[model samples]
Target: GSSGSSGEEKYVTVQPYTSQSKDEIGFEKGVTVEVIRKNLEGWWYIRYLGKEGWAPASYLKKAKDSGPSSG
Candidate 1:
């Protein structure tokens, strides 16, 4: 039997955020990203457009199952 829980990961961007430099990646408003992990310094590891880097957690928000919903 196939287990529904595959331990798959997911994430999303809340607002329009920008990276300081090549050290991180920037994202536009309401961009969906795969969350890698989060650090103690309020930084989130994410992958976008084939690029992986750290992003400020303050700018990112929790994504719904289907995606960002209108509020």
Candidate 2:
């Protein structure tokens, strides 16, 4: 907590996508997910609601920094 920058990156869902593949995940619009790994192309593995699965990169938009804390 002393250093700058948060632990990891986070993203918010912008589009609705369903993953029939067992390795992937499904998410609705307007939800935040934490990116754990980015190995596969065009996709990133994320942890959502205590479950981990691959999520489409296009479906998720990187969230901006939480404005200013002292404000």
* Candidate number achieving the greatest lDDT relative to the actual structure: 2
Report RMSD (Å) for each prediction in the order shown.
Answer: 7.2, 5.7
List, residue by residue over 1-71, the lDDT tens digit for candidate 2: 33422338888899888889879898889988888788668879887756689887888888986666775
Query: To one decimal, what is the Cα RMSD in angstroms of model 2 from the true structure?
Result: 5.7
lDDT of 1 at 28: 89
Position 4, candidate 2: lDDT? 29
- The TM-scores, one per candidate, come to 0.72, 0.76
Q: For each predicted model, how many residue pairs clash, with residues at least 3 apart or on different chains?
A: 0, 0
lDDT for model 1: 0.75
